[PDB]
């Protein structure tokens, strides 16, 4: 791997009260210029976005408190290395090894705790994103309450319907797809519920005179008006094609097979060690099914006949 | 490859005149969404910026005058395009396949024409980078010169060292390494004389109206006063061992080997497998050598003799 020396932090949560074993993907760290040293801090924070990563629901976020009896540098020999005042730790990044950072971390289901410093109002702000619903081509502030007040799917359902129109008129939001709120940067972000209507209440925070600021960002679905989805369940628009693999000497079928292809284009050879081949109907090989030393004679008999597509494709030994 | 059908541009130069055959590097340029249409400017376009890819010499210039009757992209089914009368070309970038542009294409040596109507004055801009000439931790404007005026290596180098103090000093310019001038966004940018003094008389170039303008790129080693450079031929930084891999059961030497190393750091054993492992002495697989079987015992006698710097490394077998 990489010429350098890197950290791999490889851990596991245990969590207050329930001593249950949360699972972490291990991640490298990069000792890159200035023995290089590390704040236990920053390990920890690194640990915490990880930990936050990929985080569907609001009850799947969890809190780092610091490590176990267990946390524990150690490079390829087994000799260990510590935290001293400032916490942080020295490693040797020229010998160039990669160091591991095993062991548990305490965590807690994020419960945040009051907001002794109340902020005033929180300015919400709002940046949609649009997605075409199949075949196609294809952020600023509002409201600025306080810490009650509240917002619902509609009023947001509504502004997105504002800019939809301000933007490529003539479509529509078909649905809402994601949802969520940051409270100024707070790594943790309140995802509001996918499927169904709501009403987010702001939150609260310690003031950050000027004030605090939220932001809502979506993502719904458009429709070009007047149509419709892409493959829900869809096989009208493929088109069956039956191919029948022959031995040009002995006019015997060696192999046939149906497909349904969304494209007529896709009639042509494929390659078997190429990617760019998946779509393409005609094989040259056959050496995949058993049949060996066949080879795409160039010849093929297209019924043309489109309601019954019939495709003989003539193949001989080499 | 890519799955996304691209445009592989394999064409070679022809000089005017003298009907030589430049070189050229294939590159390939991906189709992404739009049957996709290609100006052949744009073509002209890609193949100028690599004809002048990494040009050494300021004679190593050349002007791409326009496609040759030979010209030819092709699908693989050798299945030719035309262009237009807009000379753009549009492909099929759907059944997904890789087209290729061939044949040849018309240039010339960099030889500019008149400046009809002639520029005014020219702000010489200049910009100048750093770099250690060995162990170590580590752009404006001015005269305003017009066409025939001219600047030197000195006054150069003198604002190079004002700039370098400026910054860290304590420093110096050990050497000048490389030095270009960008006469606005003129493709062909001059490259002055290398290792020895010189002296740019600006250039030429039509009235960019307002001002043109110049721009200098410098690049230069520097010392930090006081000091040398790494490993011109040095060999006494350099420290001399001997390993000796010993069978720990019949104590045959099964090898034994001397190299220099640059510090003590590497006394330690190497995979053959991990490129990291590359400035470490000891190995421990012997496979590589012919000795076949062999592992690490983990154990190793270290003559401790500075001087000499013997090491006995005891291997043994599965």
């Not at 305490?106 to 419960?111: A, H, I, M, N, Q």
């Not at 005033?120 to 600025?144: G, I, R, W």
């Not at 619902?152 to 994601?178: C, F, M, V, W």
């Not at 600021?213 to 829900?232: A, N």
Request: proline fraction near 4%.
């Amino acid at each position: 791997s990489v010429n350098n020396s890197q950290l791999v932090v490889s851990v596991a949560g245990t969590v207050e009260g329930t001593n249950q074993d949360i699972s972490l993907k291990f991640f490298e760290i990069d000792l890159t210029s200035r023995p290089h040293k590390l704040e236990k801090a920053d390990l920890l924070k690194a640990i915490q976005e990880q930990l936050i990563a990929n985080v569907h629901s609001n009850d799947d976020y969890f809190e780092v408190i610091d490590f176990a009896s267990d946390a524990t540098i150690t490079d390829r020999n087994g000799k260990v290395y510590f935290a001293d005042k400032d916490g942080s730790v020295t490693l040797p990044t020229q010998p160039v090894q990669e160091f591991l950072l095993s062991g548990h971390v305490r965590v807690r289901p994020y419960k945040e705790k009051p907001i002794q410093n109340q902020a005033k109002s929180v300015d919400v702000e709002y940046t949609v994103q649009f997605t075409p619903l199949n075949p196609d081509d294809d952020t600023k502030l509002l409201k600025t309450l306080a810490i009650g007040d509240t917002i619902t799917s509609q009023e947001l359902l509504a502004q997105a319907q504002s800019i939809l129109n301000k933007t490529h008129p003539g479509y529509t939001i078909y649905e809402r797809d994601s949802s969520i709120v940051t409270h100024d940067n707070d790594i943790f972000r309140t995802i509001l519920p996918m499927d169904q209507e709501f009403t987010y209440h702001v939150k609260n925070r310690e003031q950050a005179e000027i004030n605090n600021t939220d932001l809502i960002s979506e993502k719904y679905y458009v429709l070009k008006k007047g149509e419709k989805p892409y493959d829900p369940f869809d096989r009208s628009h493929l088109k069956l094609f039956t191919i029948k693999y022959v031995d040009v000497n002995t006019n015997e079928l060696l192999k046939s097979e149906q497909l349904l292809t969304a494209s007529e284009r896709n009639l042509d050879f494929r390659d078997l060690y190429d990617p760019r081949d998946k779509a393409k109907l005609l094989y040259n090989n056959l050496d995949a099914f058993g049949i060996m030393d066949y080879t795409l004679t160039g010849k093929v008999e297209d019924n043309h006949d489109d309601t019954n597509r019939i495709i003989t494709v003539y193949m001989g030994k080499r």
